Amino acid sequence: AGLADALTAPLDHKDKGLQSLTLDQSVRKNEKLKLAAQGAEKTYGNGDSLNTGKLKNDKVSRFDFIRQIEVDGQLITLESGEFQVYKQSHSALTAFQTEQIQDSMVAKRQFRIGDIAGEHTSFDKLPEGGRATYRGTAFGSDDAGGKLTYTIDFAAKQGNGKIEHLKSPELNVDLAAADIKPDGKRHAVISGSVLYNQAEKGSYSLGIFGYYTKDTNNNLTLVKAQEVAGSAEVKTVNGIRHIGLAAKQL
């Protein structure tokens, strides 16, 4: 699988798919995150990069995470459980399957999406026309068999999707059509509603990822938006549930 190689071996530029994954939302500047798998364990801080080049693409790589916090002196364990990483060619996202937390150790189960990084497509460099259909995996708590189909129209700067084959019937939802907008860093992002049986059930956000090229005289020539990756919050009878979304072109 290459998990221990992803935790131990340094970054190699000849690896496939996404190579480096900057950990920012998964590890805050005051805390530390321990990852263990296949007999290896490494301690990552804030800003540290995860070597995803050794991981398999379009699959869920699972680790054992322990979230500690640095309070003046030694570290205090706040959380522990499973740490999921979904890798694509130009983007990757992380997920936290919380099993144990700190007493206020008490057993509590959660599922929260962590970092979502990659090669962001600038909103100012988007293609000005054409339809693009992205297909991929949508995965929730204890279920990675979700299928995502999200279409983007660049002429109208809109996009609508659909999630299928999830174990929870309330999570197979349709992603309402939403406009393409820039964020603070002017990345191409999409924020829309989540509908189930013609009922507004939640929200979803997808980031656009792809490569680009320049000519000999620093002029933009080629731009592609090949992947999308984000998350969704769906309301269920048992409470709010989060779902990780990733999709690419064929």
Author numbering: 79 to 182, 188 to 293, 293A, 293B, 293C, 293D, 293E, 293F, ...
Give the article text.
We exploited soluble fHbp peptide V1.1 as a molecular scaffold to display the PorA VR2 loop, P1.16 (VR2 P1.16). VR2 P1.16 (YYTKDTNNNLTLVP) was inserted into six different β-turn regions in fHbp. We determined the atomic structures of ChAs with VR2 P1.16 inserted into position 151, 294, or 309, all of which generated PorA-dependent SBA titres. These structures were solved using molecular replacement to resolutions of 2.9 Å for fHbpV1.4:PorA151/P1.16, 3.7 Å for fHbpV1.1:PorA294/P1.16 and 2.6 Å for fHbpV1.4:PorA309/P1.16. All ChA scaffolds align with good agreement (route-mean-square deviations (RMSDs) range between 0.447 and 0.614) to fHbp V1.1, demonstrating that the fHbp scaffold is not perturbed by insertion of VR2 P1.16. In each structure VR2 P1.16 adopts a β-turn conformation that extends away from the fHbp scaffold. In ChAs, the VR2 N- and C-termini are effectively locked into a 'biological' β-turn peptide mimic by neighbouring fHbp β-strands, as confirmed by our atomic structures. Antisera raised against each ChA detected fHbp on the bacterial surface (p ≤ 0.0001), and certain antisera also demonstrated significant binding to PorA: antisera from mice immunised with alum and ChAs fHbpV1.1:PorA294/P1.16, fHbpV1.1:PorA117/P1.16, fHbpV1.1:PorA183/P1.16 or fHbpV1.1:PorA309/P1.16 (p ≤ 0.01 by two-way ANOVA), and from mice immunised with MPLA and ChAs fHbpV1.1:PorA151/P1.16, fHbpV1.1:PorA294/P1.16 or fHbpV1.1:PorA309/P1.16 (p ≤ 0.05 by two-way ANOVA). SBA titres were detected with antisera raised against fHbpV1.1:PorA294/P1.16 when alum was used as the adjuvant, and with antisera raised against fHbpV1.1:PorA151/P1.16 (a low level of SBA from a single mouse), or fHbpV1.1:PorA309/P1.16 when MPLA was the adjuvant. Although PorA was detected on the surface of N. meningitidis by antisera from mice immunised with alum and fHbpV1.1:PorA117/P1.16 or fHbpV1.1:PorA183/P1.16, or with MPLA and fHbpV1.1:PorA294/P1.16, these antigens/adjuvants did not elicit PorA-dependent SBA titres.
